[PDB]
Amino acid sequence: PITKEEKQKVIQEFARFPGDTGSTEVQVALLTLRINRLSEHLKVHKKDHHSHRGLLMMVGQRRRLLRYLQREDPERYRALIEKLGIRG
Amino acid sequence: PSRKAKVKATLGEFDLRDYRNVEVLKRFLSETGKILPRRRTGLSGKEQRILAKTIKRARILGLLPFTEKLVRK
């Protein structure tokens, strides 16, 4: 599982500033985190379809905020993706 | 009527999750391995449900039975 530490780090890591626990980029990060872990969990248990829905959802939720990130500020988008290695 | 008494009422405080207090769980069993129904246990929706697993756990650890022959009939 994801551990507070493992988590908070990711936060602090992206947080647009001190105390920020919500900035899109944060959000996006954390997601991506879960996503990946999930994905991982799906590289096996390939028959755990249910979880994958969740995944699918996350993937979606993620790609939403992003599309919003651009619209509002293109830079913070490029900057973010690149830093998360999203796309592919 | 099932108005004999509730195993709970005629008992002290006990951790429902301690799958070893065989001197207590024992109470929650019928004159057979069987698990007394809420009407008896006296427990609650959440309780009875826990006391449920525990009596299963202990069963495995050869502590509590799964069934006891009936005496009379």
Binding site: - | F66, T67, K69, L70, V71, R72, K73
Partner: protein
């Protein structure tokens, strides 16, 4: 021709015939009776009477082996199980204890049509 005195008597009820078996204080049957052992040829074997007889009969043969005490065991439900018990009670052997051990699956084999349609 063995002398047993104390022993166990199994009672096996059914909707098609009741059958008794008397064993040594450890499961090894001494004498055994059913409804068929008696006269009755079919449906009849069910009845508490058919059962009763079936009981006394086996209580009888048992005596000859000195049988005196018996612990009652009963498996199943059916046409006159009770009569059998009451039969053995007054049959003459002293009734130590009556006890039911009827088999009940904690859900194993799919019963056959004839018995399905429940849950």
């Amino acid at each position: 021709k063995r002398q047993v005195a104390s022993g166990r008597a199994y009672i096996h009820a059914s909707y098609n015939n009741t059958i008794v078996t008397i064993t040594d204080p450890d499961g090894n049957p001494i004498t055994w009776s059913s409804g068929g052992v008696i006269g009755y040829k079919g449906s009849r074997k069910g009845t508490p009477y058919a059962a009763q007889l079936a009981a006394l009969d086996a209580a009888k043969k048992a005596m000859a082996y000195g049988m005196q005490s018996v612990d009652v065991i009963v498996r199943g439900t059916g046409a006159g199980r009770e009569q059998a018990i009451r039969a053995l009670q007054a049959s003459g052997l002293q009734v130590k204890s009556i006890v039911d051990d009827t088999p009940v699956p904690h859900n194993g084999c799919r019963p056959k049509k004839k018995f399905r349609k429940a849950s």
